[PDB]
Ligand binder design. Structure first.
Ligand SMILES: Cc1ncc(COP(=O)(O)O)c(CN[C@H](C(=O)O)[C@H](C)O)c1O
Ligand SMILES: Cc1ncc(COP(=O)(O)O)c(CN[C@H](C(=O)O)[C@H](C)O)c1O
Lengths: 399, 399
């Protein structure tokens, strides 16, 4: 045996254990645009309830037309990081619209939220500083922290008391600056961070407050500005990282929004911004259209909140356990991974499209279906999906 | 004075000393599509010699039209990671076409090359393994390796004897599996990895060979297939990472190409792939067309080769320390950061667009201009370019 081929056997062994544990993930091949209804390459039309397309913007024809126009005026790719020849007028324009929307001085675009998190902490913090994370923070945040030299603290999920004991330890350990950082809305359970309480704890210790708004920007708060708007601390957030790939168009791209001098150091020093391609023109141009849509009317935001309130009461009525609260992320816990796989594949036979979350996406013993509400769902699709959730939801033992 | 405001003052202090050191980067706002000539918002139209638009596909009309049709048929955003509702028939087709193009059994798409490298090493290698890296490996590779638990060795730049020293040491230190990793073509100096020696050196020790092919894919090799074709190792590479935002369209996306079991484990566990948005339907669609163009004829990469040799031989006979060759990346060393901004500025006034390179993009005191060739350039621009370099080179003590 050569070491190389041996390595391929340990890879094949790992792939077979993952199957055996029922933890293997099967891709489904959609053949149409992203939509509240969608058809896979088998011709079966189904109702999509597991997309980050909260506002219906991923195939919105005005967003589509803005991409078409931005291709005619601004080309297909730039093939350059921002500082060489990758900055068009669109990137500056969008950065100003994002900053105004989010309530901040400035904004720096990234290829993804993953990279915005990836290049945030290492640029702003050093070995003498501390970051204190909610224990449920998105993987991209964990990896951004791991790439920094800062001292690390984690506090129990949404546990404000634990947040206080960590800031005490952090101060006891002699932290210089301290950044408290959390998902604005948590990906896997839909809970909303208590930014109002966390603003207060932070001011008391003198710590910065950052949030990751991938599941909030565009539809949280009455004006859809985000978790910080929904919790009364709009204009009082040190650092907003977020995505363009969810409620604001769903194509690609991300951002960090902060004061002008934080953003300025990120342009000078943040490794995904120096060493990774700029956002494509068509994506930036459509993103500007998305901010016009949302600053002219809260109709999509409001319609989304209605579909969630309808569909959450609906799942409550059937004896399903309504995790979290107002949010469009409805996590239907099943704990066992195999049941999650069964329920998802049985809902596909009943014409509903959701998928199973299990390790490593969610902790072991905590598998689930994440149902996601879009503003685009019609009553027929929703009342139909409730039936399909009812049948399978009894036909497999969930109640 | 509160802790938060002191942090912000620290950031402002840091910005200032970046300006004083001659290291502050200023973006140019381009009002036009990417191309051989470009116009900033000040109306000036200049010759672009600093893009990754190596093949001119960034604004190629058939590429722009394929993005249009992809918008029509497959929408604008998918707003999902791949394992949920983020997989369309396009992603599958392109993963196959790339595997065929690169010599591999399968491909996995990422949002960028930065994230392809980000999620490689941590998914394949453990604390008991090793990674041997060329000292000048790309920042994204260093960051991928940092995120894994593998032991890290470093060999001197392109030094085949030192590569053998690390391989010996790693075995002596008891490494289980070993992966030797390198830029195919190196970002800041244009040198080509000696893949042919490395594949033989790696074979003695049963090590894996992995290569980053951003500055290669599309135009290196006879049929433009990469640094591995140009070294006659095509079909014999364990891992290829690479981008679509350089020669292959310039918009977004990346990939890792490997034996079907590597790719399958990356799908199961690679953190960027599970946890970050899928590539946008327009980019995959235009990417499939780019491979249509490049697999139909070698003309574009063939005239990139001509533009490179003409321009390399030109700067040589002008007095520039520029070797004759066909490395589309032509480094112009300047060492001083201030002298690099001045050379870029003076070349701008003379009708040529290039940008200074300085710390942390290159080592302190090793500042440069990175001329970058493209298949787009006609001889009248190539010639007018040379004239700009002869003069500003004369004016600044460079020749
Ligand atoms: C070898 C290598 N790998 C990976 C990446 C990341 O590529 P992507 O844009 O995320 O797809 C780059 C980006 N190279 C830049 C550039 O040379 O212009 C940077 C200034 O080094 C690269 O050179
Ligand atoms: C809080 C947070 N930050 C960052 C990201 C990555 O953002 P981007 O796609 O790289 O722009 C996500 C993606 N959430 C995904 C999803 O929930 O479907 C994933 C399965 O966790 C997120 O929830």
């Amino acid at each position: 045996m050569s070491n190389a081929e041996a390595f391929y056997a340990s890879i094949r062994t790992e792939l077979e254990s993952i199957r055996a544990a029922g933890l293997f993930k099967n891709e489904r091949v959609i053949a149409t645009p992203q939509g509240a209804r969608v058809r896979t390459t088998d011709g079966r039309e189904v109702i999509n309830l597991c997309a980050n397309n909260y506002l219906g913007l991923s195939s919105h024809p005005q967003v589509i037309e803005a991409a078409h126009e931005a291709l005619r005026t601004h080309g297909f790719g730039l093939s350059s990081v921002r500082f060489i020849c990758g900055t068009q007028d669109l990137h500056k324009t969008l950065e100003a619209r994002l900053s105004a929307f989010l309530g901040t001085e400035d904004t720096i675009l990234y290829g993804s939220a993953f990279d915005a998190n990836g290049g945030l902490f290492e640029t702003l913090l050093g070995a003498e500083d501390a970051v204190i994370s909610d224990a449920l923070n998105h993987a991209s945040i964990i990896d951004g922290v791991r790439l920094s030299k800062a001292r690390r603290y984690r506090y129990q999920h949404n546990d404000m008391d634990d947040l206080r004991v960590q800031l005490e330890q952090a101060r006891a350990d002699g932290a210089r600056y301290t950044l408290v950082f959390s998902d604005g809305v948590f990906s896997m359970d839909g809970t909303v961070a208590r930014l109002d309480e966390m603003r207060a704890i932070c001011d008391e210790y003198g710590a910065l407050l950052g949030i990751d708004e991938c599941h909030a920007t565009g539809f949280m708060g009455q004006r859809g500005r985000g978790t910080h708007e929904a919790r009364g601390v709009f204009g009082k957030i040190d650092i907003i990282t977020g995505t363009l790939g969810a409620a604001l168009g769903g194509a690609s791209g991300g951002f960090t929004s902060a004061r002008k001098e934080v953003v300025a150091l990120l342009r000078q020093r943040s490794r995904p911004y120096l060493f990774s391609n700029t956002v494509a023109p068509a994506i930036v141009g459509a993103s500007i259209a998305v901010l016009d849509i949302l600053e002219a009317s809260t109709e999509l935001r409001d319609r989304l909140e209605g579909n969630t309130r309808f569909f959450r009461a609906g799942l409550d009525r059937l004896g399903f356990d309504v995790k979290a609260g107002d949010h469009p992320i409805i996590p239907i816990m099943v704990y066992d991974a195999d049941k999650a796989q069964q329920l998802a594949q049985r809902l596909l036979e009943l014409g509903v499209y959701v998928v199973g979350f299990f390790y490593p996406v969610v902790p072991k013993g905590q598998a689930r279906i994440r149902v996601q509400m879009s503003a685009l769902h019609d009553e027929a699709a929703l009342q139909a999906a409730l039936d399909a959730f009812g049948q399978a939801g009894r036909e497999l033992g969930l109640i």
